[PDB]
Amino acid sequence: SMTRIIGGVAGGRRIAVPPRGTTDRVRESLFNIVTARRDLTGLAVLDLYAGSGALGLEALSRGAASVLFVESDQRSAAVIARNIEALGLSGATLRRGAVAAVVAAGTTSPVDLVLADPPYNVDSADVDAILAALGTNGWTREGTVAVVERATTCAPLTWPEGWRRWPQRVYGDTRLELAERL
Amino acid sequence: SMTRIIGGVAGGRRIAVPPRGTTDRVRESLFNIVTARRDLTGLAVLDLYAGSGALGLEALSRGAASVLFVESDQRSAAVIARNIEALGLSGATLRRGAVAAVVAAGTTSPVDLVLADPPYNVDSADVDAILAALGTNGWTREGTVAVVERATTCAPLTWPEGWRRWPQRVYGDTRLELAERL
Amino acid sequence: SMTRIIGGVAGGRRIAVPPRGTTDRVRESLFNIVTARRDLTGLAVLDLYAGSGALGLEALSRGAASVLFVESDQRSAAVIARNIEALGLSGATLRRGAVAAVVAAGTTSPVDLVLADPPYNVDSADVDAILAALGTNGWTREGTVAVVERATTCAPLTWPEGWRRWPQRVYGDTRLELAERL
């Protein structure tokens, strides 16, 4: 199947989705929330468990300078690459690998916005460990926003350390947890 | 003379200016900067040395929930009141009094955005004392943005405390200094 | 012009006065009243809108441990400094700046006695806000005495909070308002 980029310069353009996931309201809202509180212009973005790439590509559409997509599934990575090419927007890099492993090894290049939509079978307590790692392994700096999409049946996240949680939002059966590094 | 509100629901509407200050680019750019990094929706605003009220009325036009205008000069207060009326927007309060003395006495009602364009004969070191007072006397909370408009010939401000300075902007012979409370 | 210190170790010594306010009985009586109820020995004093410094210097003469003089006018600050040096008494500090802005920014060092002779052009409502600020911003502690000298044509002060007013005194066309922090 396909979904559509919501807003920005590629708004209304179609992108492919790998096999299931499993909304437009959720993605629209996510970016209304973020862009209400931050300009995407010039921002570096990390899109974890990227899947189709819908979240990172939305960010690029709305003026982010860079997005690193991290995705473990090879067919999903192919779909991401195809979507990057179809949109024609600069600044995308694709890293195919086990997400928690990439996150574990860290970086010297922090981002300003982390987007994550883990698969159904990732427990919230392992996500919590990823959130700690974002803080300590170079991925974030003061002001970095992290957004995690989870089904409402998943246990809520436990934010670490020095993150200020934003208000929690629900949409049908999906929850968005949002926080910023102090 | 008159100037115009730049954007928001009253964009284009005229407002009166007291016996002069003495731009549209400065006011436009101020709000481009702030509204890139913060949603004005629902915010509480403090407009110090308000003069015509152009800054605080701009904030109201763009969706601020409240503005407290503070102004010492009686004719200027009269102009501000006329402008609140002319515009017809809710959420405005006018307090006529000596601005530093108002700030000194404090509040239990913090704001999210402080706008200040002090007259030419207020020294920067006195503004510095006001910026400290905003911190300690109830006017601010974590996340509050402060913006001070000064002629380029004035000495730069010394931010106190735990404010993080944003990049400094200059426009002709006006500087804007912007910061947020950590 | 010149005036004389009334009492204390510097009793009867001359001090210079800036371009005028515009008495000896007022200052004599002020200290008769205060020293009837409080010992000056070892006290910390604040002299706001100090002008010539005549009040704070009187306090030092009678045994105050310290006086912080606050005065905005540069020639007046020069006169205070000259008077401090002429008397030769220790414990004087001179802070030149906008008085309400100094008061706004506060302190971690309270005083026992506040003396204030605001200029004619300062409204009683702005003095009232200073009086509030004195209580909340670190300038006072339990027992601190505040004394404000005003022309009888000025409206009376509104004392805040947990101040107990002492009896009001009048001397020609000057009033003294005295109170103590509960």
CA distance A105 to A103: 6
Contacts 24+ apart (CB under 8 A), C85-91: C86/C13, C86/C14, C86/C15, C87/C5, C87/C10, C87/C13, C87/C15, C87/C57, C87/C60, C87/C61, C89/C9, C89/C10, C89/C57, C89/C60, C89/C61, C91/C60, C91/C64, C91/C65, C91/C66, C91/C67
Q: Among candidates A92, A84, A49, which has minimal Cα distance to A67?
A: A92
Contact, A177 vs A147, CB < 8 A?
yes
CB spacing of A39 vs B37 below 8 angstroms:
yes
Distance from CA of B120 to the nearest CA of A (A): 33
CA distance B182 to A41: 22
Q: List CB contacts of C60: < 8 A, sequence separation 6 or more.
A: C8, C10, C45, C67, C87, C89, C91, C92
Q: Give me B176's structure tokens.
A: 């804007």
Helix axes B54-61, B24-37, angle to 10 degrees: 40
B91: which DSSP letter?
A: -
Contact, B61 vs B87, CB < 8 A?
yes
CA distance C114 to C133: 12
Interface test with B, best of C73, C74, C123, C126 (most B CBs within 10 A): C126
Query: What's the distance, Cα to Cα, between the start and end of chain C in Å?
Result: 39
Q: Give me C130's structure tokens.
A: 């200073």
CB spacing of A37 vs B38 below 8 angstroms:
yes
Contact, B53 vs B15, CB < 8 A?
yes
Distance from CA of A162 to the nearest CA of B (A): 12
Rounded to the nearest 5 degrees, what angle is found at the Cα of B140, between the Cα atoms of B26 and B117? 25
CA A51 to chain centre: 10
CA dihedral C29, C30, C34, C36 (to 10 degrees): 0
**Exposed e or buried b for every residue in B21-33, given b needs 16+ CB within 10 A?**
beeeebbebbbeb
> C91 to each of A12, A65, C155, how far by Cα in Å?
74, 60, 34
> C13 to each of B142, C26, C43, C108, C142, how far by Cα in Å?
53, 17, 22, 33, 33
Hey, CA dihedral for B23, A35, A88, A3, is it positive or negative? Answer: negative
Residue with tokens 């957004």: A147
For chain B, the chains sharing at least 3 beta-carbon pairs closer than 8 angstroms are A, C
Contact, A31 vs A62, CB < 8 A?
yes
Residue with tokens 């905003």: B134
Q: Give me B40's structure tokens.
A: 């004005």
Interface test with C, best of B72, B126, B140, B158 (most C CBs within 10 A): B126
Strand runs (DSSP E) across chain A, as ranges? 2-4, 14-16, 44-48, 66-71, 92-96, 113-116, 145-151, 163-165, 169-171, 174-181
Q: Among candidates B68, B84, B77, B79, which has minimal Cα distance to B16?
A: B79
Which residues on B lie below 8 Å from C103 (Cβ)?
A: 100-101, 104
CATH code that applies to domain B1-182 = 3.40.50.150
Q: Among candidates A54, A45, A43, A62, which has minimal Cα distance to A17?
A: A54
CB spacing of B137 vs C106 below 8 angstroms:
yes
Which residues on C lie below 8 Å from B132 (Cβ)?
A: 104-106
Burial class (CB within 10 angstroms; exposed 0-12, middle 13-18, buried 19+) of C65: middle
CA distance A89 to C123: 62
Distance from CA of B148 to the nearest CA of C (A): 16
Reduced to 3 states, what is the DSSP secondary structure of residue B126?
helix
CA distance B40 to B34: 9
CB spacing of B38 vs A39 below 8 angstroms:
no
Q: Entry resolution in angstroms?
A: 1.7
> ω into residue C136 within 30 of 0, thus cis?
no
Q: How was this structure determined?
A: X-ray
CB spacing of B97 vs C125 below 8 angstroms:
yes
Distance from CA of B136 to the nearest CA of C (A): 8
Interface test with A, best of B37, B178, B181 (most A CBs within 10 A): B37
Chains C and A touch (3+ CB pairs under 8 A): no
Chains C and B touch (3+ CB pairs under 8 A): yes
In this structure, the strands spanning B92-96 and B66-71 are parallel
Q: Where is chain A broken, named by the residue before each break, C–N > 2.5 Å?
A: 22
Rounded to the nearest 5 degrees, what angle is found at the Cα of C63, between the Cα atoms of C61 and C69? 65
CA dihedral C118, C124, C129, C135 (to 10 degrees): 70
Strand runs (DSSP E) across B14-144, as ranges? 14-16, 44-48, 66-71, 92-96, 113-116
> ω into residue C153 within 30 of 0, thus cis?
no
C181 phi and psi angles, rounded to 5 deg: -75, 125
CA dihedral A161, A162, A163, A165 (to 10 degrees): 90
CA distance A115 to A129: 15
Q: Give me C139's structure tokens.
A: 């300038």
CA distance B50 to B115: 8
Q: Among candidates B104, B56, B49, which has minimal Cα distance to B84?
A: B56
